[PDB]
Symmetry: C3
Subunit: 285 residues, 3 copies
């Protein structure tokens, strides 16, 4: 499971005490700012979240009489609390360091503004606790657009991806695609480490695009944005997010790769708010 | 209908008199030089044509005695006569200006040589009185050759045109093509103003080539020269003119766009008088 | 048949005597260095081969007493012997010149080292006595790889070759290919002089690639290395040599020309000792 040790490693956080508590789990992405706790109000809710002590919390705490503040830092270090981070380069109170050691609660110092750090921490947490799955298809980057090509076996997915590569686009994954929903509506795809840089074509066998075309033809990971479904305003649902989908009929008399290129171009255009299907719908009136 | 007003507007002709006659119709493209009329010989034939008075006509007229010339300019201004143009920057006779006002015959002065003006006027007239029709297919400019792509629905006409556009060629019209036979064997095609710059592709929908590819990918009008008929020394007759036609079978294992490009190249070559089908026919002997 | 006259012409060899013997046949590619003959030992074996007299032979011959050497040069000039070449710019013995004239044995002087000349002569001989045949298919040079495209009629061989030409590759022969096995595992292909530079495409007819695309699109001859068999570690046997073969299925949804390009690239890679099918076979373990 995800533990504070992973957090400290990703951001190279400065540990001050509570090293024995680095094996504590971080169950959610939510973050807590225990201001009310500084005033003596404690509760179970949010106790298992990372706690951030910034100017708001410490400016109040430091105005407390010693007899009133007594035990509040200790009560903050509950067993389930994965970490307490003193932000804005503030000095952690001696009582807190003491409590962190006694209760083995990871205590960290950060020089970052509280709000900014909170955003960075939660983003990492969402990335780590990302729902994951795998999909059959080919992931390619076309004009900066992550395109997932799907369709029945033999339809020409890998052959079309090869032509796209030949045309200057990048391969991310062939056959199987590992997908991670690292945040709301953000799907990141990558090839299994085993078939990285590989593309298999009936008749030719397995080829290495990196070896054949160089570094400019590959990309380790890419956010999915467009599903091109090859077949003999729709969408494709993957996990909890839906991405634009275009179903292109395959028949002689056309270059599927070109269609995909234009679909990616049209997509970026639509993203800018420009939609030709509407432009004409109005021109008709 | 076509009236003298349209003529004066197109060439910004200098009107001297007969403004009330600008609503007179110009029925044909033929032009008249009334020399015999200067000698007193009048007839119905050609009276409804634009009349040009150049050096030949006026040098004779100006040698006439006043009593003999009397009424000849008036008899020139017949009701059906749409316009009288004094060319070569010559001075229109007072009698002519007078007659033009009395009979409301548009009187124009031009500084151009009679023969040259005649050619320019008739060319405009043929353009205006051009026979017109519409055709299903896609018109593209490939290596300067106006190519009309035809073939059954779904064969891949628009998809192939899109690939040609992607390859640097220009789109003139998708789906419907307005054709004008502006002169003998000269067919000009253009897209209906409604679908200008548009191309529709099954699966993607309607796209704007101008927005997607820029100005270098479009062309307002183009003379048709080659018909590429996609199918699962021939010609295609359109109105009163026949254009070269090549029937290309569509099947996997080939890039139709490339075939079209070569067909256009071969066409220009044939135009230069070079024909490979003959070159080999001789090499065989 | 192959005669000494052809040999002298190809290398512009310096004839010293025996012109009347230039019509003698050169039956094999083997070459003889008659050292033992200098010592008086003669035999039928190798007598019908070109004979080379270098330092080894002449340094021994010149040490012989006149009575012992008598007749040895004459016995060297057997009727079937097509030619005797004195290499290393050595002086042919008077007795040899005399014998060559008497027996009409072509006598040549060469300034080249014996071993080097032997290699050059035999190479020419193998080229000349090359087994020959003709094959249906299209020969193109793709990234320096001689690719023979085969497959049933209508599959798209010539159309695919045309696309390859359009993509910068070179045409060697369309329809029929003249093959010459000029040495072990070395097959050279060329188009019949009659259809040189020509390519025929259904619908367009016969075109001249040289006229249409210029000199950079043609190649007179090319060694075959890869067979791409279009179909709706294998090899293709031609004469006595086998060349790598890849069978590519043709179906919509793919650009066959691109597949061929990658196959040629993969081939050069495999030649360098790099095989991706193995790279992955190991990565799986």
């Amino acid at each position: 499971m995800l533990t504070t040790k992973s957090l400290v490693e990703r951001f190279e956080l400065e540990m001050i005490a509570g090293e024995a508590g680095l094996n504590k789990q971080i169950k959610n992405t939510d973050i807590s700012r225990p201001g009310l706790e500084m005033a003596g109000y404690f509760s179970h809710y949010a106790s298992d979240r990372i706690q951030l002590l910034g100017t708001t919390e410490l400016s109040f705490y430091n105005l407390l009489p010693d007899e009133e503040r007594k035990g509040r830092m200790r009560k903050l270090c509950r067993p389930e609390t994965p970490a307490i981070i003193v932000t804005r380069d503030l000095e952690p109170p001696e009582e807190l360091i003491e409590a962190a050691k006694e209760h083995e609660t990871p205590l960290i110092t950060s020089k970052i503004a509280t709000t900014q750090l909170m955003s960075r921490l939660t983003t990492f947490l969402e990335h780590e606790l990302a729902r994951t799955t795998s999909l059959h298809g080919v992931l390619v980057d076309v004009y900066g657009v992550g395109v997932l090509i799907t369709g029945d076996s033999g339809i020409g997915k890998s052959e079309t991806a090869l032509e796209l590569i030949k045309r200057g686009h990048r391969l991310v994954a062939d056959d199987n695609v590992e997908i991670r929903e690292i945040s709301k509506d953000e799907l990141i795809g990558r090839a299994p480490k085993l078939i990285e840089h590989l593309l298999e074509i009936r008749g030719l066998g397995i080829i290495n695009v990196m070896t054949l075309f160089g570094a400019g033809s590959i990309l380790t990971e890419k956010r999915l944005r467009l599903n091109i479904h090859l077949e003999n305003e729709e969408t494709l649902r993957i996990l909890d997010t839906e991405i634009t989908k275009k179903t292109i009929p395959v028949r002689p008399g056309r270059n599927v790769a070109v269609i995909i290129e234009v679909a990616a171009m049209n997509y970026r255009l639509n993203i800018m708010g420009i939609n030709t299907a509407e432009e004409f719908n109005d021109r008709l009136n």
